Amino acid sequence: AQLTVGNSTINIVLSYGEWPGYCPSTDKPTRPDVSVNRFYTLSTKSWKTESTGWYWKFPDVLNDTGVFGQNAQFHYLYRSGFCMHVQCNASKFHQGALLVVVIPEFVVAASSPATKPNGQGLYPDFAHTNPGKEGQVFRDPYVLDAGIPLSQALVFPHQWINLRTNNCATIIMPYVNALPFDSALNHSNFGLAVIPISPLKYCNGATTEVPITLTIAPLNSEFSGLRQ
Amino acid sequence: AQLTVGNSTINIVLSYGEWPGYCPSTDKPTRPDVSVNRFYTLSTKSWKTESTGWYWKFPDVLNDTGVFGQNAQFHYLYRSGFCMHVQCNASKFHQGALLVVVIPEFVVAASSPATKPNGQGLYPDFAHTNPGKEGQVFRDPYVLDAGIPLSQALVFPHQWINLRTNNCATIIMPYVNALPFDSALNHSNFGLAVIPISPLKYCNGATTEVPITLTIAPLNSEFSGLRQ
Amino acid sequence: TMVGQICRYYTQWSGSLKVTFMFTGSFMATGKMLIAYTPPGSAQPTTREAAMLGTHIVWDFGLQSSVTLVIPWISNTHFATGIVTIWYQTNFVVPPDTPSEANIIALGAAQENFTLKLCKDTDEIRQTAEYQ
Amino acid sequence: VNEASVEHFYSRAGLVGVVEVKDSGTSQDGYTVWPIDVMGFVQQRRKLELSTYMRFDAEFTFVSNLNDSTTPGMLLQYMYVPPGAPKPDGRKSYQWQTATNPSIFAKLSDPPPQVSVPFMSPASAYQWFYDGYPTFGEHKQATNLQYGQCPNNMMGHFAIRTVSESTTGKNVHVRVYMRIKHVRAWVPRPFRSQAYMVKNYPTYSQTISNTAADRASITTTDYEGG
């Protein structure tokens, strides 16, 4: 009951019904295969009562991490998909539900501070646009830190985590863009939002923090224009 | 989900990869078959926090018990194997681990009382050498009441009881000796040691004693030289 | 271990080892540990994210009670070799009325290709007392 | 099933922007440029944001008349400045002539002019959701200005003048109607649930409009609705 790729150890939602491939010879890139193809298990988020949620930006989260992060910040062009596995370790006495959703071209927004003519420029800071490996917390999860409502987020590729039912979720995301290749540093293709729809609840004498865990595997990566 | 031999009711480790048989016509013994072949369920040991362990001596434990005990203390020669089944009844809220190990020619030792030139004869009493049906408690389980370390006891035929995993263990022991037949009263061929490697732990409001239970079936017994 | 006692009667050995872990906690407990192997010539990983890099296995308590890790290409020949660290990946999750502290047991053994050569005499038995 | 197509959902040319060529008041410089935003009006801004990616050809129509509704046979010039060209600085500017800079000469008295613009983007499709930054300009301290903006979506400009040496005393009102055609879309989105504020940025306010209406209790459906 386990599977291993490249000395890394550890149902499936296939986004838009297409399996990520390589681009053809047209329409000489470097293909690292299992060197950069492995399981990156990033840090663990403690999920609490009264927690709003978290989000990531996927070409961004691995920019500082490991071998994939080396190639990313040095090759000029980038293409790849991802296989993303979100696990939650809880007990039969905890209850709650998580909505794991993959938002293509997820663009964070800023909120105007209540009373003001609101014409001046407001803008999300660089921490919210590129949260890095640590992810970022929703201040307003109901609108997804954008204008779109949460209740319709199910139109994106998603999966439910219901603690009484399965505790794991796996989403495979093909490369989606308007260009065959793009910049890994500047452009963020999508992001995960893990949103506790139904809040977390338990009884006294149990574990308060429930450890949501995120593990992401690049798929069919290819690079171009290697600098120093 | 049960099995019966000789009006006695109630995975498997086969010791040294050999199934106990009878000796050939050479190299007229009496074979009782299912009369003495049955399940002897001896008493129950309450396993506690801060319990060191227990051990038995198998030709010895049945000497006072039942029909096998009659033939044992009256025939001059003895040969047989054993099928030994150790069960532990616990709850999903208890935790712990037991090491069940079969030590051939297990020879108890005595400990010198701290300060002394230690040249005088010291020797285990008859209670420790022949514990009988009640078994005997390890005073020092770390050395197995001998010189050998516990951590290497896994070289003997053994099995683990991990309460979160299976609660039962079964070891089949063929007859092992340097002679084809031997004395059931004087000589002890082997013994079981049930050693709580990881201690027992639970929370208030649960059952303190966890009942380790031992059930032993003679196999292919044969006897010689019947006295009065 | 029996391997560690039996390789102290020989001068040189080579081969692979395997190290098995077994979790003795309660059936209701869950969590994850990160078991990482560090090849020779490297120091002990400072933080988990440094260990998350190659040659690790993330191990879940709920799913499996036991897990195994193989150690390649060991040799002593000479005159820092290898390090296995165990990291907390998540946290130790527990329901009510169940113990919050558990134990892990480490087993180890050689594998098929392991070999020994040049038998010598062990240093553990010295025991200067001449009465033995 | 045909009336629910995305081809049919984006059809039926609507009013994109209005623009006024001013010869009358203090201004007295007849001409205007116009950006071709396509998102100018908030209501079509939603329907386009339904998808992430769009590829379409546009058909523009110019309805023009005076303050009072009259059509006294002037001549206008509809100058389409494609992306990456300069813009007229004035009515007599040298850029009104050029070439490679398509023009339409049409008298008001005529039927409205009609032209089609192909798909001009460097990429394979338009995108109104672009995460990340267009350029490397960065040592920013904190300057977040250009986040989310994409250069690839700019379609042209229209410049209109009255084709007169001397200053006319007339103000011309031009309505622009665009018809999306041959449209493909990718990666559906949810509809905007909040009120738009800035034109180019998806910013909302801290008073959060509920997605649905309200009612008395979760049980009773009695008054108003819910």
CSV table of N, CA, C and O in Angstrom, one decimal, chain A residues 1-2 7-10 38-44 65-66 87 89-91 93-94 133 205-207 209 211 213, chain C residues 28 30-32 48-49 52-60 63-64 67-68 89-97:
chain,number,residue,atom,x,y,z
A,1,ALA,N,0.8,-1.2,0.0
A,1,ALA,CA,0.0,0.0,0.0
A,1,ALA,C,0.9,1.3,0.0
A,1,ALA,O,0.8,2.0,0.9
A,2,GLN,N,1.6,1.4,-1.1
A,2,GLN,CA,2.5,2.6,-1.2
A,2,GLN,C,3.2,2.5,-2.6
A,2,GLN,O,3.2,1.5,-3.2
A,7,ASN,N,13.4,7.6,-5.4
A,7,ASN,CA,13.7,7.6,-3.9
A,7,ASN,C,12.9,8.6,-3.1
A,7,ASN,O,13.3,9.3,-2.2
A,8,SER,N,11.6,8.7,-3.5
A,8,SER,CA,10.6,9.5,-2.8
A,8,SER,C,9.3,8.7,-2.6
A,8,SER,O,8.8,8.2,-3.6
A,9,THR,N,8.9,8.5,-1.3
A,9,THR,CA,7.8,7.7,-1.0
A,9,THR,C,6.7,8.6,-0.5
A,9,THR,O,6.8,9.8,-0.3
A,10,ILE,N,5.5,7.9,-0.2
A,10,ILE,CA,4.4,8.6,0.4
A,10,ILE,C,3.6,7.7,1.3
A,10,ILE,O,3.4,6.5,1.0
A,38,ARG,N,9.6,13.7,-8.9
A,38,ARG,CA,9.6,13.0,-7.6
A,38,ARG,C,8.6,13.7,-6.8
A,38,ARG,O,7.9,14.7,-7.3
A,39,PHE,N,8.4,13.3,-5.6
A,39,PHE,CA,7.4,13.8,-4.7
A,39,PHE,C,8.0,14.9,-3.8
A,39,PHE,O,8.9,14.5,-3.0
A,40,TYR,N,7.6,16.1,-3.9
A,40,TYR,CA,8.0,17.2,-3.0
A,40,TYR,C,6.9,17.3,-1.9
A,40,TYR,O,5.8,17.7,-2.2
A,41,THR,N,7.2,16.9,-0.7
A,41,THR,CA,6.3,17.1,0.4
A,41,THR,C,6.6,18.3,1.2
A,41,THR,O,7.6,18.4,1.9
A,42,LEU,N,5.8,19.4,1.0
A,42,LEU,CA,6.1,20.6,1.6
A,42,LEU,C,5.6,20.6,3.1
A,42,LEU,O,5.2,19.6,3.6
A,43,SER,N,5.6,21.8,3.7
A,43,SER,CA,5.3,21.8,5.2
A,43,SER,C,3.8,21.4,5.4
A,43,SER,O,3.1,21.2,4.5
A,44,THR,N,3.5,21.4,6.7
A,44,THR,CA,2.2,20.9,7.1
A,44,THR,C,1.4,22.1,7.7
A,44,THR,O,1.9,22.8,8.5
A,65,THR,N,12.7,25.5,-4.0
A,65,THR,CA,12.8,24.1,-3.5
A,65,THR,C,13.5,23.2,-4.4
A,65,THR,O,12.9,22.8,-5.5
A,66,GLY,N,14.7,22.7,-4.0
A,66,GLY,CA,15.3,21.6,-4.6
A,66,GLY,C,15.7,21.7,-6.1
A,66,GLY,O,16.0,22.8,-6.5
A,87,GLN,N,-3.5,15.2,1.6
A,87,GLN,CA,-3.9,14.3,2.6
A,87,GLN,C,-4.3,15.0,3.9
A,87,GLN,O,-3.7,16.1,4.2
A,89,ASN,N,-4.9,13.9,8.0
A,89,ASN,CA,-4.8,12.9,9.1
A,89,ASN,C,-5.7,13.3,10.2
A,89,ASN,O,-5.4,14.2,11.0
A,90,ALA,N,-6.9,12.6,10.4
A,90,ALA,CA,-7.8,12.9,11.4
A,90,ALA,C,-8.3,11.6,12.0
A,90,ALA,O,-7.9,10.5,11.6
A,91,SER,N,-9.1,11.7,13.0
A,91,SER,CA,-9.6,10.6,13.8
A,91,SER,C,-11.1,10.5,13.6
A,91,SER,O,-11.8,11.4,13.2
A,93,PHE,N,-13.3,10.6,15.5
A,93,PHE,CA,-14.1,11.5,16.3
A,93,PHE,C,-14.0,12.9,15.8
A,93,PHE,O,-14.8,13.8,16.4
A,94,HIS,N,-13.2,13.3,14.9
A,94,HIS,CA,-13.2,14.6,14.3
A,94,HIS,C,-14.3,14.7,13.2
A,94,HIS,O,-14.6,13.7,12.5
A,133,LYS,N,6.5,28.9,-0.5
A,133,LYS,CA,6.3,27.6,0.0
A,133,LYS,C,5.3,27.6,1.1
A,133,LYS,O,4.5,26.6,1.3
A,205,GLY,N,-10.5,17.0,25.1
A,205,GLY,CA,-9.6,15.9,25.2
A,205,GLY,C,-9.2,15.2,23.9
A,205,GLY,O,-8.5,14.2,24.0
A,206,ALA,N,-9.4,15.9,22.8
A,206,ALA,CA,-8.9,15.4,21.5
A,206,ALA,C,-7.9,16.3,21.0
A,206,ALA,O,-7.5,17.4,21.6
A,207,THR,N,-7.4,16.0,19.8
A,207,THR,CA,-6.3,16.8,19.2
A,207,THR,C,-6.9,18.0,18.5
A,207,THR,O,-7.8,17.9,17.7
A,209,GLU,N,-5.2,20.6,16.6
A,209,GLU,CA,-4.7,20.7,15.3
A,209,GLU,C,-4.9,19.5,14.5
A,209,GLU,O,-4.6,18.4,14.9
A,211,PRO,N,-3.7,17.9,10.9
A,211,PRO,CA,-2.6,18.2,10.0
A,211,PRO,C,-2.8,18.0,8.5
A,211,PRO,O,-2.6,17.0,8.0
A,213,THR,N,-1.8,18.0,4.8
A,213,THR,CA,-0.5,17.8,4.2
A,213,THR,C,-0.6,17.9,2.7
A,213,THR,O,-1.6,17.3,2.1
C,28,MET,N,-6.2,3.8,17.2
C,28,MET,CA,-6.9,5.0,16.8
C,28,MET,C,-6.0,6.1,16.4
C,28,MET,O,-6.5,7.1,15.8
C,30,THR,N,-3.1,8.5,14.6
C,30,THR,CA,-2.7,8.7,13.2
C,30,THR,C,-1.6,9.7,13.2
C,30,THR,O,-1.3,10.4,14.2
C,31,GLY,N,-0.9,9.9,12.1
C,31,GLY,CA,0.2,10.8,11.9
C,31,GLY,C,1.1,10.4,10.8
C,31,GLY,O,0.8,9.5,10.1
C,32,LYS,N,2.1,11.2,10.6
C,32,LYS,CA,3.1,10.9,9.6
C,32,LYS,C,4.5,11.3,10.2
C,32,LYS,O,4.7,12.3,10.8
C,48,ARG,N,13.9,19.7,8.3
C,48,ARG,CA,13.1,18.7,7.6
C,48,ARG,C,13.1,19.0,6.1
C,48,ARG,O,13.2,18.1,5.3
C,49,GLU,N,13.0,20.3,5.7
C,49,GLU,CA,13.0,20.6,4.3
C,49,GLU,C,14.2,20.2,3.6
C,49,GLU,O,14.2,19.8,2.4
C,52,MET,N,13.7,16.5,3.3
C,52,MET,CA,12.6,16.2,2.3
C,52,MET,C,13.2,15.8,1.0
C,52,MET,O,12.7,15.1,0.2
C,53,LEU,N,14.4,16.3,0.7
C,53,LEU,CA,15.1,16.0,-0.6
C,53,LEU,C,15.5,14.6,-0.5
C,53,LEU,O,15.3,13.8,0.4
C,54,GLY,N,16.3,14.1,-1.6
C,54,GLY,CA,16.2,12.7,-2.0
C,54,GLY,C,16.5,11.7,-0.9
C,54,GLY,O,17.1,11.9,0.1
C,55,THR,N,16.1,10.4,-1.2
C,55,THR,CA,16.2,9.3,-0.3
C,55,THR,C,15.4,9.3,1.0
C,55,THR,O,16.0,9.2,2.1
C,56,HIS,N,14.1,9.6,0.9
C,56,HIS,CA,13.3,9.6,2.1
C,56,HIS,C,12.0,8.8,1.8
C,56,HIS,O,11.7,8.5,0.6
C,57,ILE,N,11.3,8.4,2.8
C,57,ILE,CA,10.0,7.8,2.7
C,57,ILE,C,9.1,8.4,3.8
C,57,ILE,O,9.5,8.5,4.9
C,58,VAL,N,8.0,8.9,3.3
C,58,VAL,CA,7.0,9.5,4.3
C,58,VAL,C,6.1,8.4,4.7
C,58,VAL,O,5.6,7.6,3.8
C,59,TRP,N,5.9,8.2,6.0
C,59,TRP,CA,5.3,7.0,6.5
C,59,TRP,C,4.1,7.4,7.4
C,59,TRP,O,4.3,8.1,8.4
C,60,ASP,N,2.9,6.8,7.1
C,60,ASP,CA,1.7,7.1,7.8
C,60,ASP,C,1.4,6.0,8.8
C,60,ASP,O,1.5,4.8,8.5
C,63,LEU,N,-2.3,4.0,7.9
C,63,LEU,CA,-2.3,3.0,6.9
C,63,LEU,C,-1.5,1.8,7.2
C,63,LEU,O,-2.0,0.6,7.3
C,64,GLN,N,-0.2,1.9,7.5
C,64,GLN,CA,0.7,0.8,7.7
C,64,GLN,C,1.3,0.9,9.1
C,64,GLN,O,1.6,2.0,9.6
C,67,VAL,N,7.2,-0.3,8.2
C,67,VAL,CA,7.8,0.3,7.0
C,67,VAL,C,9.2,-0.1,6.9
C,67,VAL,O,9.8,-0.4,7.9
C,68,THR,N,9.8,-0.1,5.7
C,68,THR,CA,11.1,-0.6,5.5
C,68,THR,C,12.0,0.4,4.7
C,68,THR,O,11.4,1.0,3.8
C,89,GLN,N,6.6,14.6,10.4
C,89,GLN,CA,6.1,15.3,9.3
C,89,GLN,C,4.9,16.2,9.6
C,89,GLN,O,4.8,17.3,9.2
C,90,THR,N,4.0,15.7,10.4
C,90,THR,CA,2.8,16.4,10.7
C,90,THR,C,2.6,16.7,12.2
C,90,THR,O,3.0,17.8,12.6
C,91,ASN,N,2.2,15.8,12.9
C,91,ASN,CA,1.8,15.9,14.3
C,91,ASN,C,1.2,14.6,14.7
C,91,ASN,O,0.9,13.8,13.8
C,92,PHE,N,1.0,14.4,16.0
C,92,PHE,CA,0.5,13.1,16.5
C,92,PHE,C,-1.0,13.3,16.8
C,92,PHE,O,-1.3,13.9,17.8
C,93,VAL,N,-1.9,12.7,16.0
C,93,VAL,CA,-3.3,13.0,16.1
C,93,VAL,C,-3.9,11.9,16.9
C,93,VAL,O,-3.6,10.7,16.7
C,94,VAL,N,-4.8,12.2,17.8
C,94,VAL,CA,-5.3,11.2,18.8
C,94,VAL,C,-6.8,11.6,19.1
C,94,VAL,O,-7.2,12.7,19.1
C,95,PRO,N,-7.7,10.6,19.2
C,95,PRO,CA,-9.0,10.8,19.7
C,95,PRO,C,-9.1,11.0,21.2
C,95,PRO,O,-8.0,10.8,21.9
C,96,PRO,N,-10.2,11.2,21.8
C,96,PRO,CA,-10.3,11.3,23.2
C,96,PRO,C,-10.1,10.0,23.9
C,96,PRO,O,-10.4,8.9,23.3
C,97,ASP,N,-9.6,10.0,25.2
C,97,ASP,CA,-9.5,8.8,26.0
C,97,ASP,C,-8.6,7.8,25.4
C,97,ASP,O,-8.9,6.6,25.4
